[PDB]
From Swiss-Prot, chain A:
Ubiquitously expressed. Residues 252-353 form the PH domain. Phosphorylated by MAP kinase p38 (MAPK11, MAPK12, MAPK13 and/or MAPK14). Ubiquitinated by the BCR(KLHL20) E3 ubiquitin ligase complex when previously phosphorylated by MAP kinase p38 (MAPK11, MAPK12, MAPK13 and/or MAPK14), leading to its degradation, thereby restricting RhoA activity and facilitating growth cone spreading and neurite outgrowth. May play a role in the regulation of RhoA GTPase by guanine nucleotide-binding alpha-12 (GNA12) and alpha-13 (GNA13). Acts as guanine nucleotide exchange factor (GEF) for RhoA GTPase and may act as GTPase-activating protein (GAP) for GNA12 and GNA13. Involved in neurotrophin-induced neurite outgrowth. The poly-Pro region is essential for plasma membrane localization upon stimulation. This is Rho guanine nucleotide exchange factor 11. Interacts with GNA12 and GNA13 through the RGS domain. Interacts with RHOA, PLXNB1 and PLXNB2. Interacts with SLC1A6. Interacts (via DH domain) with GCSAM (via C-terminus). Found in a complex with ARHGEF11 and ARHGEF12; binding to ARHGEF11 and ARHGEF12 enhances CDC42 GEF activity of PLEKHG4B, and PLEKHG4B, in turn, inhibits ARHGEF11- and ARHGEF12-mediated RHOA activation. Residues 21-210 form the DH domain.
From Swiss-Prot, chain B:
It holds the Pfam family Ras. This is Transforming protein RhoA. The modification (Microbial infection) O-AMP-tyrosine is found at Y32. Changing T17N: Decreased Rho protein signal transduction. Decreased substrate adhesion-dependent cell spreading. Decreased stress fibers assembly. Decreased cytoplasmic microtubule organization. (Microbial infection) The basic-rich region is essential for yopT recognition and cleavage. It is linked to Ectodermal dysplasia with facial dysmorphism and acral, ocular, and brain anomalies: A neuroectodermal syndrome characterized by linear hypopigmentation, alopecia, apparently asymptomatic leukoencephalopathy, and facial, ocular, dental and acral anomalies. Patients show no intellectual or neurologic impairment. Changing P69S: In EDFAOB; somatic mosaic variant; decreased Rho protein signal transduction; decreased substrate adhesion-dependent cell spreading; decreased stress fibers assembly; decreased cytoplasmic microtubule organization. It catalyses: GTP + H2O = GDP + phosphate + H(+). Changing E45K: In EDFAOB; somatic mosaic variant; decreased Rho protein signal transduction; decreased substrate adhesion-dependent cell spreading; decreased number of stress fibers assembly; decreased cytoplasmic microtubule organization. Its EC number is 3.6.5.2. (Microbial infection) Substrate for botulinum ADP-ribosyltransferase.
Length: 355, 178
């Protein structure tokens, strides 16, 4: 409910509005930390431990769904116990920045980001697998509806609950920003809370990057299997022959998405294009295959192009090859919307600067 | 039970969290406005149908481009917000939030909500915008945006007064059932 109306009922009458607001935000943080711990313990008790002991799936698939749940629990449980220890010494919480730095700064940061990234990075993949399994295996579907019918799931499904770690991590900067707001400035307390908030954003940046690379890798592995580099081993021009063995797995993806290729005299091509670190790859989607085929090269080395926005067309943009060997080739590419063109431009230009 | 999933998207401090709190509670947070809204199942009735509507906040996810999509799978309806007191938030609807919602939730109904409608006629608000040659978003502007993004429907509310909050979610639930 509320800090005011429960703890510190007799002691509220003395404080300022700012010290009340400060006490409320600290209380909400404390209370939602206990509430997160309770969710993690639902995941443990209702899902993970039963899935393990009853052998609902192979240990290897289970390890990819709950890589490190016990360590995730302890990362929050110990922080929670320290919270309880502070609450004991009086209903008005004094300085709190040390408690924050003890979770979000130095070694404590390194640990938390490591553990949160391990838990989340692969999660979207693991949930697709559990969806498939639910659909193909009746004992597993039954187990899932049995488990999800438990009152502690609060009418939510595994895939609703398992995302709470990531959601909890995004709350921390908001909670801190709100504690800072009601802290008297010029204080070390304020300066250290500001540090802790800046460190949380950094942790979130780290987890963001971890999900990103794990998803991107798995995507690229799948594209490689569908990759058809037939028409390129003999080809029509040696501007294309070196990419006969492309292997998308050795590259890092920056971006991807559908583009329309204005190639000829009112003749177009709907492509699926991958912006990699070094290359822009143009592919044709047959339906379940990715075609590397040429006339124009399907692969453009980013170090040897320029990006120009089209004057009259708010959706299109040009990619111009600057290599003296590689004839008067402008690639005209059309994005979905003007916004799509924007982000396609910004990323193409950035990648080109770094190439 | 008819189970449906709602995800609210939009720029930060355009009051997403606050919108969800008043709906699920039927009351505006009097003494203290919470920062935290946990994943929550609201009971809502429309056209004679009981629906368990799962409410998902994305407050805090605005800067993390690869943490956001995690909330998107299996969504039944998207509540896209802007704030009537920030024409910035509105330009961001076509520029950031609809290409993203259309990419990760193809064919999922979208309702467009202008929050803080109680700020179309705030004098303090009006001045601030007139600085940057702006003004509170007009109903027609929100409705025109709604038509351009192919939204299911356009809605306005004020979390402060509760006005329009109930109808916002009623609309979102009908969209989920479509």
């Amino acid at each position: 409910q509320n800090w005011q109306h429960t703890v510190g009922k007799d002691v509220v009458a003395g404080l300022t509005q700012r010290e009340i607001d400060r006490q409320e935000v600290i209380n909400e943080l404390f209370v939602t930390e206990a509430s997160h711990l309770r969710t993690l313990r639902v995941l443990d008790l209702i899902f993970y431990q039963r899935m393990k002991k009853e052998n609902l799936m192979p240990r290897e698939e289970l390890a990819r769904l709950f890589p490190n749940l016990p360590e995730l629990i302890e990362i929050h449980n110990s922080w929670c116990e320290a919270m309880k220890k502070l609450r004991e010494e009086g209903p008005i919480i004094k300085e709190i920045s040390d408690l924050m730095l003890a979770r979000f700064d130095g070694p404590a940061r390194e640990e938390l980001q490591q553990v949160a990234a391990q838990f989340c990075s692969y999660q979207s993949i693991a949930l697709e697998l559990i969806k498939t399994k639910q659909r193909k295996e009746s004992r597993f579907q039954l187990f899932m509806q049995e488990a999800e019918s438990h009152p502690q799931c609060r009418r939510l499904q595994l895939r609703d609950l398992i995302i709470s770690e990531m959601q909890r991590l995004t709350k921390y900067p908001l909670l801190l920003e709100s504690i800072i707001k009601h802290t008297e400035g010029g204080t070390s307390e304020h300066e250290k809370l500001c540090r802790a908030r800046d460190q949380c954003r950094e942790i979130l940046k780290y987890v963001n990057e971890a999900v990103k690379q794990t998803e991107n890798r798995h995507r690229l592995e799948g594209y490689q299997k569908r990759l058809d580099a037939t028409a390129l081993e003999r080809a029509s021009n040696p501007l294309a022959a070196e990419f006969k063995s492309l292997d998308l797995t050795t590259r890092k993806m920056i971006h991807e998405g559908p583009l329309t290729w204005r190639i000829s005299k009112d003749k177009t091509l709907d492509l699926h294009v991958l912006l990699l670190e070094d290359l822009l790859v143009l592919l044709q989607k047959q339906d379940e295959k990715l075609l590397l085929k040429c006339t124009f090269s399907p692969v453009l080395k980013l170090n040897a192009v320029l990006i120009r926005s089209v004057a009259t067309d708010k959706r299109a943009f040009f990619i111009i090859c600057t290599s003296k060997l590689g004839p008067p080739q402008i690639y005209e590419l059309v994005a979905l919307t003007s916004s799509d063109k924007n982000t396609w431009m910004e990323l193409l230009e950035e990648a080109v600067r770094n190439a | 039970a008819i189970r449906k999933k709602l995800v609210i998207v939009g720029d930060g401090a355009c009051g997403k969290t606050c919108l969800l709190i008043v709906n699920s509670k039927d009351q505006f947070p009097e003494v203290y406005v919470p920062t935290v809204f946990e994943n929550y199942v609201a009971d809502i009735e429309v056209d004679g149908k009981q629906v368990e509507l799962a409410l998902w906040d994305t407050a805090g996810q605005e800067d993390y481009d690869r943490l956001r999509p995690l909330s998107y799978p299996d969504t039944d309806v998207i509540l896209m917000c802007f704030s009537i007191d920030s024409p910035d938030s509105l330009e961001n609807i076509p520029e950031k939030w609809t290409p993203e919602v259309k990419h990760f939730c193809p064919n999922v109904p979208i309702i467009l909500v202008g929050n803080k409608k109680d700020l179309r006629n705030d004098e303090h608000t009006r001045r601030e915008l007139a600085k940057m040659k702006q003004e509170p978003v007009k109903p027609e502007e929100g409705r025109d945006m709604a038509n351009r993004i192919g939204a299911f429907g356009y809605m306005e509310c004020s979390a402060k007064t509760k006005d329009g909050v109930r109808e916002v979610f009623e609309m979102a639930t009908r969209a989920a059932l479509q």
